[PDB]
């Protein structure tokens, strides 16, 4: 299963020039492009090997569009400030995310396009790629403007067309990396936390993609009480890490097992102290 | 590949 996602952030800085605009693009859990309004290149830039092969027409095109994205966001900041009756003095944020999913069979699975103002939902394209979900009266004004200009249709065409088309092209051109699965390297550690209790920490390392399920069990049964799960995190080499811990009573560690599920594994793994 | 243009709010 696969996805392409673009994330766009603009942040106004009242007394200090035009908004900071940062754009990043991903294919699954792999970043492949970026743009930073403050950076020197003023170009869309590569961040994956397989995208560098793309010709200068690609780079010129993506750099024109990403810049137009930021200029449009620059307008939004002014408009939203008006919609909400806010002062010139405060820094505010707009975020746009859009992208598309394909099945394991490479056929179109779903599209999305949503928008937030100061970190909360403002407006979003519904799953039918035809209609809009608008939070408040401001977002309703936006909703009507967008319905009127058939924005959902333009977006539908992109998500079902170009989006999935270039996701596929990227997945081909970079198959050697994007389509490999790195199964998690796995182990358990043990810490005595008190006279009578120990923590068991179950580790998953250098796995890819990021999707993974670590669960604990007690006597072959799912267990949540006293379990701690951290956010899946980047190792920085393109792979991911995660751990899950339980606090058990000392001398009962044999009762517990950790189970690991991951696309790269022939089958789920079990670990015990 | 970026959408050709985005809508202002």
């Amino acid at each position, epitope marked *: 299963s696969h996805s392409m996602r673009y994330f766009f952030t603009s942040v106004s800085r009242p007394g200090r020039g*035009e908004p900071r605009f940062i754009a990043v693009g991903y294919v699954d859990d792999t970043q492949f492009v970026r743009f930073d309004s403050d950076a020197a290149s003023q170009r869309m830039e590569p961040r994956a090997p397989w995208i560098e092969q793309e010709g200068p027409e690609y780079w010129d095109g993506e750099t*024109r*569009k990403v*810049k*137009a994205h930021s*200029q*449009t966001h*620059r*307008v939004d900041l002014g408009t939203l400030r008006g919609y909400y009756n806010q002062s010139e003095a405060g820094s505010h944020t707009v975020q746009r995310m859009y992208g598309c999913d394909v099945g394991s069979d490479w056929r179109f699975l779903r599209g999305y396009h949503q928008y937030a103002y100061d970190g909360k939902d403002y407006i979003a394209l519904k799953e039918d790629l035809r209609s809009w979900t608008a939070a408040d009266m401001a977002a309703q004004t936006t909703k009507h*403007k*967008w319905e009127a*200009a*058939h*924005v959902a*249709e*333009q*977006l*539908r*065409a*992109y998500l*079902e*067309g*170009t989006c999935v088309e270039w996701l596929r092209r990227y997945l081909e051109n970079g198959k050697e990396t994007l389509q490999r699965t790195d199964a998690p390297k796995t182990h358990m550690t043990h810490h005595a936390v008190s006279d009578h209790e120990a923590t068991l920490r179950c580790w998953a390392l250098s796995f890819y993609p990021a999707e993974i399920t670590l669960t604990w069990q007690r006597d072959g049964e799912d267990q949540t009480q006293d379990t701690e799960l951290v956010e899946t995190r980047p190792a920085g080499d393109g792979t991911f890490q995660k751990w899950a811990a339980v606090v058990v009573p000392s001398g009962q560690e044999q009762r517990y097992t950790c189970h690991v599920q991951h696309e790269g594994l022939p089958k789920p793994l079990t670990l015990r102290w | 590949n970026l*959408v*050709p*243009m*985005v*809508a*202002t709010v």
Partner: T-cell receptor
Amino acid sequence: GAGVSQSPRYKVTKRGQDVALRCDPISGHVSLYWYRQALGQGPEFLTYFNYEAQQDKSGLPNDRFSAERPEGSISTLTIQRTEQRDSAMYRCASSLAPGTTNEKLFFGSGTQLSVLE
Amino acid sequence: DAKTTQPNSMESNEEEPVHLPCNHSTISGTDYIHWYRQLPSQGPEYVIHGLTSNVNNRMASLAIAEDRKSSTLILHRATLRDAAVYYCILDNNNDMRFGAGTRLTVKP
């Protein structure tokens, strides 16, 4: 102002000399375009701005042509070392904002530039 | 090269309908169709635009083919005042690039 304003309406410029053409867009319009138009042809795209930023200048025919919009309002198109070939109707246009909402283009009266040897 | 295609000239009688044809065979679902007109001695001005639905306003109707490969600007009752150049524009990013248009003459 309420409408797109260009000055001078007409201009005779001696070939080899520079000329500056002014566009005042509709107040608050983020986008500004420059076109030029020859007899029996449609407008030829020259350059386009969003605020102060020149987002596309692929249409500028050569290094003698340059445009600026220093404060995101007034734009000046300067042609250095004019050639007869530069003679044309120079047309400014503005629209409220860039993007999929397709804010319509508003066109000005234009500047008839005639470069004479 | 050019993205729309139009007859260079055309003529019709006053107080009768005008169908102004445009071709844009190589078009995407993200390409909008715009029509602008240019009256004598004036600059271009917006007439109508749309995506896939037919459009109607006070000045005209926009008829878009099912396959979106051609379109028609309809002047329901052209007056002499409607003689002008009509431009058919294909656009997906606000480039707003103009072709040579169709020059309409309205016979009295």
